[PDB]
């Protein structure tokens, strides 16, 4: 009741609890001390924590039962941002412990009571044509967010390149940032397909290493390396 | 004295009696040119020293 | 009520609140302490912040409920200026958090309660014929503000040159200022097309 309140003979006044002002960038993280129903009308168990947002009330006042653990700032993600929620909230309202969920861009959301960010507001991997990604399916048959809906098995790598704004899923793991090596005609590298063991000479366009290729170091015999650096033109460099 | 720009096309002004042969290694075509023309190297044309 | 006011037996006078004079270059940034309706007639929630401009009132007086956070100067952009609004105000009146909006030239506007400039009053990129721009589509299929309405994919570059007064959108990002190299006949450069390697 707003105004000067006159306490009765039975009631002992301790203090005036101040209602906390909720903005769109903040929410109230509070637990429950006793079983009760809040002002929304949903019964809350003992020890259950939940969030009070602006969609519920513009100015909620920490109730006698509710223990305010602290305000929670909003976890806003830009269009070039993603984040990994540790222990997300499922459809039943309880935390799915041990699981993780990826959130895409442009989704301003609140960290639920138990949800944590894995590393914070990470940046989504945008890639050029000559840039790319080597991945590792931590689980089996992801077959998701793939253009060909190809399903990698657990532990095998694949290559994602080109103009793709790729966000690593909860199952996959980015191994290393891969860059295409610019090679013109009559120049190239020695790639080694470790899946089949063979080493080939790729010459032509700017080649980008696939999922199962590593650069092979050609070891020339000694003496030959001196004749390639020294003998640039033996028709003119011949006196020595 | 001044260092040359590696980006720019290597051009050599051939005199009217001199002759330079350039080896276009990209297509394995050897051409030799003479006259007042300055020859311009391609991506892999090299002079005959 | 204008004039000498005689307070009653019940009312205790604290201080005379001064009405702040609003000019076209200034506006009142204030929040609300309690749920109420202001002099315009629109109900305001607890903690909601809004702006009072000259189109509402020439001289608004910070109300008992309204807490004035401070005056806000106008954010004027010339015809050769652009700016990026961080967390813009959408059609519902609430901030679109995490998004950004570009404002073109000759638009004097007020910074809404939550909107921030990304880097201030930036200058729009005007380019000559021998000047140009290398971009990077931070998102996919911009297909906007393009003469051929070509849609770049996310992460690939394109070249904008010529007499164009170009203002970088919220999706694209300018990588480097590119200048054309003046070459006459029998002179030139060695360009390397890294998309094809040659």
Curated annotation (Swiss-Prot), chain C:
The chain holds residues 200 to 397 of 893 of the full protein. Required for normal vault structure. Vaults are multi-subunit structures that may act as scaffolds for proteins involved in signal transduction. Vaults may also play a role in nucleo-cytoplasmic transport. Down-regulates IFNG-mediated STAT1 signaling and subsequent activation of JAK. Down-regulates SRC activity and signaling through MAP kinases. The vault ribonucleoprotein particle is a huge (400 A x 670 A) cage structure of 12.9 MDa. It consists of a dimer of half-vaults, with each half-vault comprising 39 identical major vault protein (MVP) chains, PARP4 and one or more vault RNAs (vRNAs). Interacts with TEP1. Interacts with PTEN and activated MAPK1. The phosphorylated protein interacts with the SH2 domains of PTPN11 and SRC. Interacts with APEX1. May interact with ZNF540. MVP repeats lie at residues 19-73, 74-124, 125-180. Transmembrane segments: none annotated. It is found in: Cytoplasm; Nucleus, Nuclear pore complex; Cytoplasm, Perinuclear region. This is Major vault protein. Present in most normal tissues. Higher expression observed in epithelial cells with secretory and excretory functions, as well as in cells chronically exposed to xenobiotics, such as bronchial cells and cells lining the intestine. Overexpressed in many multidrug-resistant cancer cells. MVP 3 mediates interaction with PTEN. MVP 4 mediates interaction with PARP4. The lineage of its organism: Eukaryota, Metazoa, Chordata, Craniata, Vertebrata. It comes from the Eukaryota. Induction: Up-regulated by IFNG/IFN-gamma. Phosphorylated on Tyr residues after EGF stimulation.
């Amino acid at each position: 009741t707003v105004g000067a309140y006159l306490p009765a003979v039975f009631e002992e006044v301790l203090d005036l609890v101040d209602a906390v002002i909720l903005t769109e960038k903040t929410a109230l993280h509070l637990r429950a001390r006793r079983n009760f129903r809040d002002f929304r009308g949903v019964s809350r168990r003992t020890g259950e924590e939940w969030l009070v947002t602006v969609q519920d009330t513009e100015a909620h006042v920490p109730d006698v039962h509710e223990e305010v653990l602290g305000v929670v700032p909003i976890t806003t993600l830009g269009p070039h941002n993603y984040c990994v929620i540790l222990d997300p909230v499922g459809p039943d309202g309880k935390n799915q412990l041990g699981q993780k969920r990826v959130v895409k861009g442009e989704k301003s959301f609140f960290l639920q009571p138990g949800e944590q960010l894995e590393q914070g507001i990470q940046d989504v991997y945008v890639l050029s044509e000559q840039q790319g990604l080597l991945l590792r399916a931590l689980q089996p048959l992801e077959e998701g967010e793939d253009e060909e809906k190809v399903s990698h098995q657990a532990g095998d790598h694949w290559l994602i390149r080109g103009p793709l704004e790729y966000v690593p899923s909860a199952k996959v793991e980015v191994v290393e940032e891969r860059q295409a090596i610019p090679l013109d005609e009559n120049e190239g590298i020695y790639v080694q397909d470790v899946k089949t063991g063979k080493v080939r000479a790729v010459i032509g366009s700017t080649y980008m290493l696939t999922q199962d290729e590593v650069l092979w170091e050609k070891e020339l015999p000694p003496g030959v390396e001196e004749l390639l650096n020294k003998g640039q033109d033996p028709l003119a460099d011949r006196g020595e | 004295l001044a260092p040359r720009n590696k980006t720019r096309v290597v051009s050599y002004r051939v005199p009217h009696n001199a002759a330079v042969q350039v080896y276009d290694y990209r297509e394995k075509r050897a051409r030799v040119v003479f006259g007042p023309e300055l020859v311009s190297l391609g991506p892999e044309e090299q002079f005959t020293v």
